[PDB]
Design a protein around this ligand. Structure first.
Ligand SMILES: CN(C)CC(=O)Nc1ccc2[nH]c(=O)c3ccccc3c2c1
Length: 213
């Protein structure tokens, strides 16, 4: 069960620096409805490079054994697309010093997994956070079949980290929010977010209920 199964009608979708081909907000609305019908729920945005986007959508979300041992390892997403937007690019530059813009993805999880999503009131960089999160999830870090949401730093927007096992149960489709080839390293323009996407982007109640501290 990968995002490729949930793209709806229309042509073949592909990721490009000039936007996701054959993807529109109207198509997203159909896809979203298909995912909801099958029991999935939207949990946030994931920004990544083009090739990674393609892998995630058509091959599925899989851990790639990166930063093993790091207690905060997992699949990073954000309810606010602006936070994800910053990571939507190639990591390493081209042969000629060009870093291409990436893509914004929408991440869906089976509804029955929602009880494993937790929120902290602490910032995740605070030295106390690891221990507070371990108390929420009931086991030592790293995250497993569970997720944590909290601020990245004080005042920061809130990131959600899915444990890799839980992330393997997600399905991911493209967002209709574009990235800008001129605005690599930059901030998302709020006005490029389609209103009709916003309307289907509410998060579950763990994300707004007071964080645990
Ligand atoms: C520099 N990055 C492209 C690679 C990386 O080091 N990690 C990583 C890589 C991709 C990421 N994409 C996300 O949407 C995101 C959202 C909230 C918080 C973190 C992330 C995120 C983090």
């Amino acid at each position: 069960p990968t995002g490729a199964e949930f793209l709806g009608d229309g042509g073949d979708v592909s990721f490009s620096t000039r936007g996701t081909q054959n993807w529109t907000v109207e198509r997203l609305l159909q896809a979203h409805a298909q995912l909801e019908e099958r029991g999935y729920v939207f949990v946030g945005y994931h920004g990544t490079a083009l090739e990674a986007a393609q892998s995630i959508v058509f091959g599925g979300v899989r851990a790639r054994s990166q930063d093993l041992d790091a207690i905060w390892r997992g699949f990073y997403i954000a309810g606010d697309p602006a936070l994800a937007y910053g990571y939507a690019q190639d990591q390493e530059p081209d042969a000629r010093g060009r870093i291409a813009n990436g893509a914004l993805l929408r991440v869906y999880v089976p509804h029955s997994s929602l009880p494993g999503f937790y929120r902290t009131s602490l910032t995740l960089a605070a030295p106390e956070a690891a221990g507070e999160v371990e108390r929420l999830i009931g086991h030592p870090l790293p995250l497993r079949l569970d997720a944590i949401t909290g601020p990245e730093e004080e005042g920061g927007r809130e990131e959600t980290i899915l444990g890799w096992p839980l992330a393997e149960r997600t399905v991911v489709i493209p967002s209709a929010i574009p990235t800008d080839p001129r605005n690599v390293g930059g901030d998302l323009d709020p006005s490029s977010i389609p209103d009709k996407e916003q309307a289907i982007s509410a998060l579950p109640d763990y994300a707004s209920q007071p964080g645990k501290p």
